[PDB]
């Protein structure tokens, strides 16, 4: 009932990190959806709607259950998904203990004290905190720490996945324009749910994980992958969910480790969420002492792909494509992205 | 896109001979390529075929022993090793690249692009 | 092998004519609701080229005045206004299955 909603949430936040040129895409939009769910909690009415309606949410507010059940979904189970939210605040600063409660009970999220007067040790509990939750995936986080920091919200996830198909594997060129550049690829001849789009002019391929995820591959034509992001709706993924076909194709597919950092509060800021970044903030339900703002908001996402008669097609994933991981219970958005070159 | 064969010539029944086909005007390494040859009755017959990385070999069961097809994307050219010549493989060896074009959620290969051919002539 | 037997085997047809080549292949040649069915023009001295792909979509270049159509197990090539550069040998060919056959041949030649 929510899905259709952060769905479009997804591309829209996507569509807007195409702009923002040529670089790895990949961030999960039902953990930044989550994040900033949660962090409505301690936000008044007109703070409160903001984060709401930038969400592409008449809404019922039993969203956060909605979130509970997909979240519990996604609890550990069966795939190593790695998410977490981590809300630093600065010591003193008066806090109610009424919102520290339910970011734990609801959202699993942890919060911490900090002095971000000592802009360099504040960074290194900060990333030490999700260096910790992802056991060295991700390192260094933050790179840049505002002096006026009062109040941060980092968002990890990692994923590597569990191939229902094991897929050995060998090197090849990596297109990235009209460029060259080399990588390892990955390849299996057999049968697989690949098809072609004329609306989208490109190559759908659809692979499931062993956790109940199924990711989708979109390999666009000669230089039609503009066309594709745009032509990208909630409507036509659902048909290619639905649709159960099998042909035989010899697929090319790259071994990658791609990372994507954002700074939410530029990025959402474009999407309508600013009162909570903006000096009139109301953040009364997180301190009711003195005025607060959400000073930081970076969001990191660590995707490591690996293996788990008739001429057929060669399908080969060598030149920037998009992809996208929809958890198949619950038919949400997990990840999406855009492999430009698995070399960065 | 040019093609240009090359290596045919007058070979005695039973001989070998190794045609080339040097490509150029595109990525060489991402098409698949092909031998047809056309005997002086102006009849075609498809003689083999490769993938774009030369994993994959292609050709019917009367050329299977004696021809084989490779490729070197390195010097971006076609070959075609022959042995145990014959005289009814006297035709005309053209080598084309197989493009997969698109049309309703699947393609079909088509030789698009031809070069100029090499004669090969097998007789006492 | 899929046998492709095309019909006939030569053809007379006066400028601004309609020219209909027909393609009977002993096997389907459909699979995933397109047909593998190619057709091919080739001049003497010259090197085939690629006319008709899909059975039914102008190749690169190919102009409107060169039509194909069919399904199945039976195909046809339909040049409308016939032009003085259409004398040439023209040849279907199909890629559902390995080995790659072509037909037989036709000689197209004009009627004046």
């Known amino acids: 009932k929510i899905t259709p909603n952060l769905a479009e949430f997804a591309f829209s936040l996507y569509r807007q990190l195409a702009h923002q040129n040529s670089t790895n895409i990949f961030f999960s939009p039902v953990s930044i959806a989550t994040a900033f769910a949660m962090l409505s909690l301690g936000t008044k009415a007109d703070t409160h709607d903001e984060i709401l309606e930038g969400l592409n949410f008449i809404p019922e507010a039993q969203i956060h259950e909605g979130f509970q059940e997909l979240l519990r979904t996604l609890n550990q189970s069966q795939l190593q998904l790695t998410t977490g939210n981590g809300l630093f605040l600065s010591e003193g600063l008066k806090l109610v203990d009424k919102f520290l409660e339910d970011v734990k009970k609801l959202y699993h999220s942890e919060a911490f004290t900090v002095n971000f007067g000592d802009t360099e040790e504040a960074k290194k509990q900060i990333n030490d905190y999700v260096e910790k939750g992802t056991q060295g995936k991700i390192v260094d986080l933050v790179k840049e720490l505002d002096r006026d920091t009062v109040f941060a919200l980092v968002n990890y996830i990692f994923f590597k996945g569990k191939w229902e198909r094991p897929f050995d594997t060998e090197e090849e060129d990596f297109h990235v324009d009209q460029t060259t550049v080399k990588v390892p690829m990955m390849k299996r001849l057999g049968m697989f749910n690949i098809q072609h789009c004329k609306k989208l002019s490109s190559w759908v391929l659809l692979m499931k994980y062993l956790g109940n995820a199924t990711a989708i591959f979109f390999l666009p034509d000669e230089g039609k992958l503009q066309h594709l992001e745009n032509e990208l709706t909630h409507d036509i993924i659902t048909k290619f969910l639905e649709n159960e076909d099998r042909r035989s194709a010899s697929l090319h597919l790259p071994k990658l480790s791609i990372t994507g950092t954002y700074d939410l509060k530029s990025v959402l800021g474009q999407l309508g969420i600013t009162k909570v970044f903006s000096n009139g903030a109301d953040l009364s339900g997180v301190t009711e002492e003195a005025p607060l703002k959400l000073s930081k908001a970076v969001h990191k996402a660590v995707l490591t792909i690996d293996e788990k008669m008739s001429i057929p097609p060669e399908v080969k994933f060598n030149k920037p494509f998009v992809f996208l991981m929809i958890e198949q219970n619950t038919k949400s958005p997990l990840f999406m992205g855009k492999v430009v070159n698995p070399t960065q | 896109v040019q093609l240009v064969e090359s290596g045919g010539g007058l070979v005695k029944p039973g001989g070998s001979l190794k045609l080339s086909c040097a490509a150029s005007?595109?990525?060489?390494?991402?098409?698949?390529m092909s031998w047809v040859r056309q005997t002086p009755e102006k009849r075609l017959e498809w003689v083999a075929t490769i993938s774009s990385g030369g994993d994959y070999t292609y050709s019917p069961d009367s050329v299977k022993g004696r021809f084989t097809i490779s490729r070197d994307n390195a010097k971006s050219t076609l070959y075609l090793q022959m042995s145990s010549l014959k005289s009814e493989d006297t035709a005309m060896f053209y080598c084309?690249?197989?493009?997969?074009?698109?049309?309703?959620?699947?393609?079909?290969?088509?030789?698009?692009?031809w070069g100029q051919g090499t004669s090969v002539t097998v007789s006492s | 092998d899929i046998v492709l037997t095309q019909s006939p085997d030569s053809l007379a047809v006066s400028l601004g004519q309609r020219a209909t080549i027909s393609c009977r292949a002993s096997?389907?040649?459909?699979?995933?609701?397109?047909?593998?069915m190619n057709w091919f023009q080739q001049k003497p001295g010259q090197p085939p080229k690629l006319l008709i792909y899909a059975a039914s979509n102008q190749g690169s270049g190919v102009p409107a005045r060169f039509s194909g159509s069919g399904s199945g197990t039976d195909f046809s090539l339909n040049i409308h206004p016939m032009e003085e550069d259409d004398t040439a040998m023209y040849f279907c060919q199909q890629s559902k299955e390995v080995p790659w056959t072509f037909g037989g041949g036709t000689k197209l030649e004009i009627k004046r």
């Open positions: 005007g595109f990525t060489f390494s991402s098409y698949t």
């Open positions: 096997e389907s040649v459909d699979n995933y609701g397109i047909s593998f």
């Open positions: 084309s690249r197989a493009e997969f074009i698109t049309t309703a959620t699947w393609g079909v290969y088509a030789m698009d692009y």
